[PDB]
Amino acid sequence: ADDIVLKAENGDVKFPHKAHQKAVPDCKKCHEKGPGKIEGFGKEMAHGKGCKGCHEEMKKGPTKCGECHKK
Ligand code: HEC
Ligand code: HEC
Ligand code: HEC
Ligand SMILES: C[C@H](CCC(=O)O)[C@H]1CC[C@H]2[C@@H]3CC[C@@H]4C[C@H](O)CC[C@]4(C)[C@H]3C[C@H](O)[C@]12C
């Protein structure tokens, strides 16, 4: 399947799966969550543990605006 882009007004956000599968061997960080995670995602989650927050905790991955968002 293909990567997805989140259409943030300020600039597209690419989500590259290959890098994540390799770097986050604990698949259950994202997969087999109970219901509600598709409806639940948004800016708050993205800027918290949904994206940026995991990058901070794991000490790797983009944490600056322009590293995630790119027109
Ligand atoms: C969140 C940061 C994730 C982690 C960590 C892992 N996966 Fe993932 N997976 C995630 C998303 C948002 C998607 C769909 C969008 C996309 O870019 O693909 C997926 C998709 C998969 C798939 C389908 C892939 C394909 O057919 O190309 C598989 C088989 C899958 N995910 C498995 C998987 C495993 C085994 C992981 C740990 C090693 C893993 N994923 C990490 C989100 C996230
Ligand atoms: C942990 C549970 C993560 C979540 C949730 C998200 N990301 Fe992530 N990401 C994570 C790690 C440990 C890394 C480092 C991978 C590496 O090999 O450097 C990343 C990396 C990225 C990248 C850069 C990939 C690259 O090839 O350099 C991007 C663009 C990225 N992450 C974006 C991203 C987004 C948009 C997420 C939410 C939708 C997200 N990540 C979640 C760990 C985790
Ligand atoms: C990845 C790790 C990100 C970093 C670092 C920053 N942003 Fe972000 N942001 C990210 C995603 C995946 C999303 C989309 C949420 C969704 O609904 O799917 C966003 C969202 C925004 C928004 C709202 C966009 C909209 O509603 O259309 C804004 C205004 C925004 N982001 C700005 C922004 C700034 C200024 C940042 C640095 C301080 C920043 N983001 C970091 C992913 C990530
Ligand atoms: C559930 C995990 C981990 C974050 C958490 O613990 O909540 C998060 C990490 C990235 C999130 C995905 C990002 C791309 C998509 C954003 C959509 O708007 C909702 C569905 C998707 C596919 C999201 C589903 C889910 O919200 C995920 C996989």
TrEMBL record:
Binding site for heme c 1: A1, H17, H20, C27, C30, H31, C51, C54, H55, C68, H69
UniProt keyword annotation of Nucleus present: no
Residues given in the record as heme c 3 binding sites: H20, C51, C54, H55, K60
Annotated deoxycholate 1 binding sites: K37
Residue sites binding heme c 2 per the record: E9, H47, C65, C68, H69
Cofactor(s) of this protein: heme c
Any one GO molecular-function label of the UniProt entry: electron transfer activity
Keywords carried by this UniProt record: Electron transport, Heme, Iron, Metal-binding, Transport
Entry binding sites for deoxycholate 2: K37, K49
Cofactor binding, per record: Binds 4 heme c groups covalently per monomer.
Entry annotated with the keyword Magnesium: no
Designated name of the protein: PpcA
